[PDB]
Design a protein around this ligand. Structure first.
Ligand SMILES: Nc1nc2c(ncn2[C@@H]2O[C@H](COP(=O)(O)OP(=O)(O)OP(=O)(O)O)[C@@H](O)[C@H]2O)c(=O)[nH]1
Ligand SMILES: Nc1nc2c(ncn2[C@@H]2O[C@H](COP(=O)(O)OP(=O)(O)OP(=O)(O)O)[C@@H](O)[C@H]2O)c(=O)[nH]1
Ligand SMILES: Nc1nc2c(ncn2[C@@H]2O[C@H](COP(=O)(O)OP(=O)(O)O)[C@@H](O)[C@H]2O)c(=O)[nH]1
Ligand SMILES: Nc1nc2c(ncn2[C@@H]2O[C@H](COP(=O)(O)OP(=O)(O)O)[C@@H](O)[C@H]2O)c(=O)[nH]1
Ligand SMILES: [Mg+2]
Ligand SMILES: [Mg+2]
Lengths: 430, 427, 55, 430, 427
């Protein structure tokens, strides 16, 4: 039929994938063991009898995170060939995850993903998860995309990556790693969505009433976005949006593809008791700077085309009035050479809840993917962080010692400057 | 599967390691007879890091014991956990220590080194993987200061890739227990700078000051001091043994903390510590651990961070806690105290979290920092060496072992160059 | 409404296991082995005073 | 339908507000929890299930007054978003609540008022409460009005403020705050009603029978005036008056807008047993200086246009006779260019009495809104008090240190000075 | 959430402060062991203003105790509520006080200064917000007078915005407990004027006079005197802790009462103080409190307001009472005694109402006023200082510590100028 392949790389990918497959299995009604107590086939394969197996590949260069799944409840769900573990991690070193260690396991990895696609008759895209700061998320993720570009060609490769936060930082060598991975992402990826932990933390505190969240709560938020993102292929609705429609509608040029994500309503039980949450309200919640999952102000730049997806008992008349109302907002700036500005989507399957969850049981919800020049503010930040370290040659010896050439450091800086030129030139006057 | 080889050389190293195995065995739940009697399945997940299993459910550590005289080996043999170790791993000479660096490095070291290296070899080649080595020694003695450097050079020759992390104790600034330490420490510094990837410096005096000020211990024996130091070894490698939300092994730490090849000496610390009876006055939370970790009094080395500036810092957290709480605390301490951190490195504080805290604590933390304040300590030993060397004085006892006077000038030259390199990067 | 009242029940349970921490102050003080109790080890009886050096 | 939004600032605004909503909820027939044991749309919205929610926002820079509502019986009525509390109050300092602390919370508030206006299908105005002497009442109130003016524009923003008393005073810096706030109010506000505590004390002791009142009794008296003021929009009547009519009918010029308030009959339940209280009686009682809610005698000045609101059993025939009689009274003056001079409205629903209430159950009552030149007496007293302190500059250093430039102090004095002679020109005749 | 940090210095501060916590603990309902055993929910609303909670339901005050000799400290712990305080906030020296201002300021102050500031830093940076600090000390001594002024500068340097409220006891005119008081009081005044925001002045003689005139105590002890002072400290912060019809915290009081930066010295008084035989005759009405507050005998400072003129006045009321009745009394007393108020400030009386009264009393009031009568108290010490300084005297004791003779001249010059400043504003 129609189907998507999910690959999880590094801790930040597989830990999100744990939350995604919990949500996916419980939404369709499959027990964690893979049996039953429809749209099953877009994400699972039916081995026979009454058992189901996901289309997922779990990979990290160190076995601690993966062995949690092998020992956890979901151990009965996955096929052990899918669960791939290396020996020693990349030590937050791009060169170690790309040049020395990465090439030891890449060909074993590529056989499994290709094998999984043979059972896949109607493949239409890939979903890949990264963390930019990590050695494996950036070093090995770059090596993965470079090969999949020639292995599969003109198939949309969508990514879900955690972009480094403005102030919250857990790796000192983080600014070095993002620029190196930026060069490899920019040519091969069809479109890569942006999220960051710093905005998710504030969102997980203000709207959802949690005093002290963990990585677990943030992972359920991201799983909801992907579930809403892929629901058009699974459930019935009124305006279906395929994977290829994202590729053309969202990105105007080759190198301006990076979007940002949003979701609404994200609300607790007590507040949703008071709020009506009709179509007009949820559409207004999307455009506030607080709901953005990237801590960048949209008011700094301007908007290119955005894509809107509605899940619930939503009537098309209300959708048109909402966006027409949005166009009346003079605080929202759109670029003149995009007077169309929008694509809509409607589906009938409401959002789904989880035991021990954090969210409210709403009848309708909307998910937003937006392309804006505001994230040029984010790149100029990361470029400046790189400049201070490399001016004094702050961490070059570690990268060069593991096979990396120094010549890549200025080149990766050069490509980013071209990207910085491309954004404000796009945002320039008609 | 990231096995680590542990070596104990000298009196100071041997006794610290003896207490260090009591900490691990309790944390894993291994009976002193070497058998498992623990309480959780998670303890048997990755016991292979530190232990070998003998057929019959008897677990044996990867430990090698070295000394020049048999006095300390018999002391460990009579210890509570003495039967744990493998008897063939006990390697020792039959001569007095001599408290002489040249004698240990040249006269007795060479005959022992060829046997010691083969003792390393059975254990290092026996395991599936080998990430790094672990050495405990002093830098004021004759056996640890001299023979430890000799083995470190040889281990670098055979195993270039592996992480040669060592744990050292520096001679004290006010009162010390040996007349001729400045000669010993200066000669050893040349070897450690070039061969060892990670060196942690600990001062006995700061250990006493922590004992009175926080622990209130009126008479701190060497058991308490070694136990406090044993906490830091247990904290650093805990990320290998237990799962967590954000893993950070040894090589993650080296790449993050070390900006340049020669600046890799570290100061360490631990939190929380219990004031007797006053723990009923304290509400332990994640912010409280942050207060102790970056409190300068809890530092285990007698070099004041406030007189210098920081380059990199790293904190581990153990227990079930919020990840937002951890990341907000690191940002808070870095923003409130901008004066002590360098501009050309943003985000000077690394963080990590582990799931399982040690027994007796529902949460615990470990702090490792790298700062320019090491210039205070190296000025101390250089000054005593200078006024001793001008008079010549006790060189008479090192020359009659085969050490040229040219080696003293070279040793000072490299030591002084290390001090200048910290001076320059303060700008 | 029910999920909100359910949510507060979970918090009260979590605070109970938070307040358990008074248990591990007991271990911290009762730790005699770790010499927060100052044991006076190794059989001081004036025939000798010692069995293990550092003790 | 037709909606009005209520905004409450500071200690005075908040505890007046919970008094008013106690009245409205009792009047309409809704429990404090929002359930039932019509004109709901004018003040309330219908949430999920049959629960209702006020169209109100409570704002203060300190939590004590707001937290009283949060733990009170009415806590379940309000949506927790509506109750906004700052960290530390303005300390009766205009600069502290305008520049330093006010700008810390201004943008959070403006989202909540704007978001509540989206649910306002037929919005026609706002109601805003102040106390002139307070720092948050004046300083943050001015900033709120300044922002709100450009946000909405052609919407009738009505204010209901407490003018500092002629002699009763609780703050020494009270004259400074009133004059600085006056310059901001005069340009932005459409119309603002004056009352003072000193007159409300005298009325609640003389006419209404209490030996020793508190602020609780006064707040209930204010609620009656607003209840009758909005009764035209809610319940049936023979002569309806919308909010926009009050703006046009009362104020002759831009700057002379300030009216004063009166109400009749205010009578204890024993005294109400004596008299029939016909229409002519209550109209005559309105115009005596004793019943004025501002302690300035209108006989010192003259009347421009007055607005009268009748509630209950009144018949339009009796109204015409009563006002004709009042024109015959030669103790009442009118400027010559206001021969008409009146706007009248009749509504059928009588006032509502309260448990623990003070007033009687009268079935015909009248409220008066009148604009008079006798208010110019109040400005001169306030202006005199400002000059004595400013000549030796008794408190400039506190305001300057908190972000004010000194040059604003003479400007607000000038703008008041023009208004003082503005009143004399209008007081003249040709 | 307007936390306040409390600092006690010297013999006077520790005994006043210790009695102060007995008052608050019973008001909020805290058992002396530190656990809540109260009677109303309103008590736990805003106990965070003064307390921290130890996990276990145990509440710890934000108290820091400072002295040069440990004699007074062990007298505090011997008290009933001494167990409440955190043991590590006890900061003390091992030298005699000396009763010397210079010795406390220069010799022993510097050694203790660094340790005290970090103890301040723990409590100041452990709370969500910080409004100001609260200092209790006397001026005639050497410990609280000397070291208190030094700490007052450091607090101002680090934390300029916060309110540095201090309570001072002034040396008495007739009988006093120290010969060298004119030297101690004159030097300390320079630091108070420029650094602290609010200063409240208490005289011991007036405290005796109130006890014998009003309370009719046949044998008053320092406990009864210190009980009176604690009531005023309790009253001022009551607006923070409990709801009220008209709120007025510290920052409101400073803005209204202080017209110019240097004129911020205040007098206080407390009503109702009822004789044990007059209770059956006195009917408690709001006007009855007004009579006691503005009565000259009730003032806690031995300076007669009638000899000067008022600049501002403030009254706080506790309990459920009429707002009209309170406001009418301020008008009544102002208009009936017009000769004692300045013309160029109208409405010189500030008022407030707080809902919750002290235990046992169904209504109570607090008075804070600022007046030109302070010229009396400073002229007194200036005259004694001049005669003691015209010839040299005990001065050699201060010179041998490091204090220069020019500092005395600067001390008198600033003190003299403040006297003239109040002279000018009387016109
Ligand atoms: N949302 C989310 N982010 C995570 C999680 N775990 C780690 N991260 C993020 O991942 C970022 C760093 O990347 P890494 O944790 O090093 O991942 P990696 O690609 O495996 O890098 P290596 O461990 O060195 O191989 C941090 O900024 C974290 O915020 C998680 O469970 N959920
Ligand atoms: N009618 C009436 N007036 C009140 C009431 N409460 C306070 N006031 C008046 O309010 C004035 C003081 O200002 P506040 O009410 O404190 O206003 P505010 O903005 O909160 O002042 P801040 O505390 O600085 O924030 C005084 O003149 C009081 O007379 C009340 O309940 N009813
Ligand atoms: N922490 C600690 N230090 C010790 C212990 N025993 C000795 N030392 C210190 O180690 C320093 C040198 O040790 P030394 O005996 O020369 O070791 P050697 O090189 O093997 O001879 C001395 O200054 C001792 O103070 C111990 O049990 N614990
Ligand atoms: N009001 C009051 N005064 C006291 C108390 N204890 C001592 N004093 C007086 O305070 C004055 C100065 O005390 P001192 O011991 O010099 O305090 P220090 O030098 O700051 O430590 C002396 O004259 C004492 O009589 C007390 O409990 N209450
Ligand atoms: Mg990894
Ligand atoms: Mg307020």
């Amino acid at each position: 039929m129609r189907e998507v392949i999910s690959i999880h790389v590094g801790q930040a990918g597989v830990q999100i994938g744990n939350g995604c497959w919990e949500l996916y299995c419980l939404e369709h009604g499959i027990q964690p063991d893979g049996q039953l107590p429809d749209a099953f086939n877009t994400f699972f394969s039916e081995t026979g009898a009454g058992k189901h197996v996901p289309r997922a590949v779990f990979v990290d260069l160190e076995p601690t995170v993966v062995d949690e799944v092998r020992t956890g409840t979901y151990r009965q769900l996955f096929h052990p060939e899918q669960l791939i573990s290396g020996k020693e991690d990349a030590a937050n070193n791009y060169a170690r995850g790309h040049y020395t260690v990465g090439k030891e396991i890449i060909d074993l990895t590529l056989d499994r993903i290709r094998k999984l696609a043979d059972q896949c008759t109607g493949l239409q895209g890939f979903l890949i998860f990264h963390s930019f700061g990590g050695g494996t998320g950036a070093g090995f993720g770059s090596l993965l995309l470079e090969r999949l570009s020639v292995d599969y060609g003109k198939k949309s490769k969508l990514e879900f990556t955690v972009y480094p936060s403005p102030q919250v930082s857990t790796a000192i060598v983080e600014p070095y790693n993002s620029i190196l991975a930026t060069h490899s992402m920019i040519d091969h990826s069809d479109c890569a969505f942006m999220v960051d932990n710093e905005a998710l933390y504030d969102l997980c505190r203000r709207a959802l009433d949690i005093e002290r969240p963990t990585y677990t709560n943030l992972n359920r938020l991201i799983g909801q976005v992907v579930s809403s993102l892929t629901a058009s292929l699974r459930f019935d609705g009124a305006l279906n949006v395929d994977f290829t429609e994202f590729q053309t509608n969202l990105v105007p040029y080759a190198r301006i593809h990076f979007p940002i994500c949003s979701y609404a309503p994200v609300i607790s039980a007590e507040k949703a008791y008071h709020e009506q949450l009709s179509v007009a309200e949820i559409t207004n919640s999307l455009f506030e700077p607080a709901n953005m999952m990237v801590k960048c102000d949209p008011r700094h730049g301007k908007y290119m085309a955005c894509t809107l997806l509605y899940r619930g008992d939503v009537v098309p008349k209300d959708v048109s009035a909402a966006v027409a109302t949005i166009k009346t907002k003079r605080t929202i700036q759109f670029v003149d050479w995009c007077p169309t500005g929008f694509k809509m989507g409607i589906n009938y399957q409401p959002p789904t809840v989880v035991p021990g969850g954090d969210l409210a049981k709403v009848q309708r919800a909307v998910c937003m993917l937006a392309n804006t020049t505001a994230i040029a503010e984010a790149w100029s930040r990361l470029d400046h962080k790189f400049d201070l370290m490399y001016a004094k040659r702050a961490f070059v010896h570690w990268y060069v010692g593991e096979g990396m050439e120094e010549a890549e450091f200025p080149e990766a800086r050069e490509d980013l400057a071209l990207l910085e030129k491309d954004y404000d030139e796009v945002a320039a006057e008609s | 599967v990231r096995e680590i080889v542990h070596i104990q050389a000298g009196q100071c190293g041997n006794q610290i390691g003896a207490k260090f195995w009591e900490v691990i065995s309790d944390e894993h739940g291994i009976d002193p007879t070497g058998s498992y009697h623990g309480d959780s399945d998670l303890q048997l997940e990755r016991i292979n890091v530190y232990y070998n299993e003998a057929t019959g459910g008897k677990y044996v550590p990867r430990a090698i014991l070295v000394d020049l005289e048999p006095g300390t080996m018999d002391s460990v043999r009579a210890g509570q956990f003495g039967q744990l170790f493998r008897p063939d791993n006990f390697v020792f000479g039959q001569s007095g220590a001599g408290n002489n660096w040249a004698k240990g490095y040249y006269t007795e070291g060479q005959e022992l080194c060829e046997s010691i290296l083969d003792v390393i070899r059975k254990e290092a080649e026996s395991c599936d993987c080998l990430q790094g080595f672990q050495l405990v020694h002093s830098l004021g003695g004759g056996t640890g200061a001299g023979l430890g450097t000799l083995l470190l050079n040889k281990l670098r020759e055979e195993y270039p890739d592996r992480i040669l992390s060592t744990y050292s104790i520096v001679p004290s600034p006010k009162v010390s227990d040996t007349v001729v330490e400045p000669y010993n420490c200066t000669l050893s510094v040349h070897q450690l700078v070039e061969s060892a990837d990670e060196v942690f410096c600990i001062d006995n005096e700061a250990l006493y000051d922590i004992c009175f000020r926080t622990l209130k211990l009126t008479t701190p024996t060497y058991g308490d001091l070694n136990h406090l130091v044993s906490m830091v070894m247990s904290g650093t490698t805990c990320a290998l043994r237990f799962p967590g939300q954000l893993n950070s092994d040894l090589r993650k730490l080296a790449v993050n903390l070390v900006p340049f090849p020669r600046l890799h000496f570290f100061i360490v610390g631990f939190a929380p510590l219990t004031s007797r009876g006053s723990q009923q006055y304290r509400a332990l939370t994640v912010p409280e651990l942050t207060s102790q970790l970056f409190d300068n009094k809890n530092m285990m080395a007698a070099c004041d961070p406030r007189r210098g500036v920081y380059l990199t810092a790293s904190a581990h957290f153990r227990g079930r806690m919020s990840s937002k709480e951890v990341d907000e605390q690191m940002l808070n301490i870095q923003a409130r105290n901008t004066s002590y951190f360098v501009e050309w490195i943003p985000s000077n504080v690394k963080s990590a979290i582990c799931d399982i805290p040690p027994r007796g604590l529902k949460m615990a933390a470990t702090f490792i920092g790298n700062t320019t304040a090491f210039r205070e300590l190296f000025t101390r030993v250089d000054s005593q060496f200078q006024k001793m060397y001008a008079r010549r004085a006790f060189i008479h006892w090192y020359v009659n072992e085969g050490l040229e006077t040219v080696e003293f000038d070279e040793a000072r030259s490299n030591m002084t160059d290390l001090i200048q390199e910290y001076e320059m990067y303060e700008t | 409404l029910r999920l909100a009242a359910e949510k507060r029940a979970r918090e009260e349970e979590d605070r109970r296991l938070d307040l358990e921490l008074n248990q591990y102050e007991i271990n911290s003080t009762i730790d005699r082995l770790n010499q927060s109790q100052a044991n006076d080890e190794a059989a001081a009886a004036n025939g000798g005073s010692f069995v293990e050096g550092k003790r």
